[model samples]
Target: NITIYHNPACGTSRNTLEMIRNSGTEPTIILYLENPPSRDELVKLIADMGISVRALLKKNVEPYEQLGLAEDKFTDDQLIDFMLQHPILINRPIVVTPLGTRLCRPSEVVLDILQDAQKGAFTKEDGEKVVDEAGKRL
Candidate 1:
């Protein structure tokens, strides 16, 4: 089953969840603010997003500002430690599958991931196409 690290208060997160429901996939919802993933899981998630540790951070989050993490460079382990101490520092709506992962940022990205899943599988070589509400390429 797919897992979504969700924060219910965020409209985009809620939208991602709704998309999952619409897809008929009962996604394993992880209320990350309340129950964050382990550091190892986070490392894997970063790999899935095709981003570095810093790229997975939410720069605008309170923890990022309070700790001044943006002021200095940190290693991947250090970054993961920060996330362990403050889950809110991590970005939201991370969607992961057996094949790939997406940050689920644009709402349309979530739809794309689900569409790929529903079709049984896809390749990154497919180039991640997503259609808009009017069925136009976005």
Candidate 2:
């Protein structure tokens, strides 16, 4: 089963979700802000992605600067602690599939892990033509 830690407010997240649907699978979409993950599940996803905990932080969120998270003084576990407290601190659009797990920042990155041929015309919210009517990547 495929899953996505999604924030509908984010354009990137929306693009990623739409891309997954384009592959003909409606992935399990978790609205992480409203319903955050358990610590164990969070850690497992991190390890599965093989990325540093710091890599999953969202600098644009509030309390991030308030906590001085950029000082690099906090441990990885501590970072996760902060995230559990302020789920907004956790970066968004983290997608998991049988192929792999990824932080789909650029939106289009989700395509890399998807297997189905996305034959539909697709575009970004900003009018970026990603897939044309001919089912071609533009």
Candidate 3:
């Protein structure tokens, strides 16, 4: 089973979802903006991803600047707090599968953990050619 923390409005998130589907599974999609994860859940996710809170933060979000989240001194708890209050501050589609978990920012990152990616060439939503004509990762 796979689970994806998704934001439909974000193109990257949408692209990541498509990649997951191409990988041959219908993932459990979480519209994180509407149903934000709990503090504990977020912490667990960060740990599962083996990345720092800063890695999961979206600096371009509106509240990020307003809340001065760019400041390096903020603790993980502080960052998590801000993300809880402002879901938009949470970056991208975080995909979790039995193989591993990842924050698929470039969308292609999902390929690393996909169990069975589509066997044909395909273009990303942004027109990036990830798969070659022979279905090879490019």
Candidate 4:
């Protein structure tokens, strides 16, 4: 099964979900705002995507720049806590499968993720893959 961290209000997120559904994938939508994923799960996901915590965020939100979240004062744990409080901070329409995870930011990445899953390919956990600073699978 596939899980899509979706926000219907976001155009890109909604578009991605619609595309996935149209593809006949029928993914399970989590509606992260209603029931967001835990901090550990998000931490793992950020690690897998090979990006900084801020990169996983929705910078368009009002509190984004006001809070100055890009500062160095915030540790990973602090950022994770903030995200827990504000699920909208993270990027939208993240698609995750057992094989691996993929950010549907550009939407095209979904194809690559699907291809990888079809081949049962998973990122090596050698700590060399380096999906994120914490070394999670992307």
Candidate 5:
């Protein structure tokens, strides 16, 4: 099954969710903003994604500046704690599937995790063509 940590307020997140739905697979959607993941859960998710904590972080946002997280010296545990304290610090729409877990940033990144059958021609919410009219990844 596919699962997504969604934030309704994020346009990219919304687009990613729609993309998954159009694939004919109804993913288990989690509104992370309203129900944030616990620190342990976040840690596991990051580990599963095989990415650094900073990669999963939402940089350039006010919360990042206000929390003084701009410094590059924070340990993984410290970063995770800060994320737990401020869920907004986490970048959105993390997708988890049998294929793997990933932080779907550009929204189109989610395409990588989808099965070939799910990668047919489709237009993004922003009107960008993801796959071509011939049903090929573009």
Candidate 6:
């Protein structure tokens, strides 16, 4: 199953979702801020993405600063608790495909796990090229 933990208000999330569509598949979109994942599911996601929990965190969110997540003292479990308590602390555009799961930070990172090649040329909202007219990643 192809799925994306999305945040529509974020530009990078939009770009990643658009790239997934360009790959000729409609992923199940999870608007995580509105409907958060269960705590176990969240941990599994972190484990599968193979990144530290802190890496999956959205440092730019207000709650991060407000909740003192910047300190190195919190354990992975504690960090997860913070994320579960405030869904906004989770980062955007986490994608899952049969191939793998990844936190698509640069938007184009989603390409690695996408099952299909892109359909055509694509660009971010700011005009950075992601793919060429030949449907190949740039």
Better of 2 and 5 by TM-score: 2
Estimate the Cα RMSD of every predicted model relative to the unseen true structure: 6.2, 1.4, 1.3, 10.3, 1.6, 1.0
Model 1: worst 10 consecutive residues (lDDT sum): 117-126
In angstroms, the error of model 4 at 51 is 2.0
Model 2 has an lDDT value of 0.90
- Cα lDDT computed for each candidate against the true fold: 0.76, 0.90, 0.87, 0.68, 0.85, 0.91
Per-residue lDDT tens digits for candidate 1, residues 84-136, read 89999888789875656888886558766765433322212225544434445
Per-model TM-score versus the true fold: 0.80, 0.92, 0.92, 0.73, 0.90, 0.96
lDDT of 2 at 112: 80
lDDT of candidate model 4 versus the reference: 0.68
lDDT of 4 by residue, 27-49 (tens): 89999987888877888888776
28 in model 6: Cα distance from truth in Å?
0.9
Q: Pick the candidate with the highest TM-score.
A: 6
lDDT of 2 by residue, 1-138 (tens): 899999999999999999999889999989999898999989998998778999999997787989999897999999999999999998989999999888998898888888786768889889998888787778
Count backbone clashes in candidate 5: 0
Winner on TM-score (2 vs 4):
2
74 Cα displacement, candidate 5 (Å)? 1.2
Error of 1 at 85 (Å): 0.9
The list of candidate 5 runs beyond 4 A from truth reads none
Give a tens-digit lDDT track for model 6, residues 33-88: 98988999999999999999999888967999988888898999999998888999
Query: How do these models rank on TM-score, best leading?
Result: 6, 3, 2, 5, 1, 4
Please give, for residues 21-128, the per-residue lDDT of candidate 3 as tens digits: 876789999999888899998998899888899999998779998988888889889889989999998898999888888898788888888888676676888798
Among all candidates shown, the one with the greatest lDDT: 6
Model 3, runs deviating above 4 Å: none
Q: After TM-score superposition, what is the CA distance of residue 48 in candidate 3 from its true location, in Å?
A: 1.6
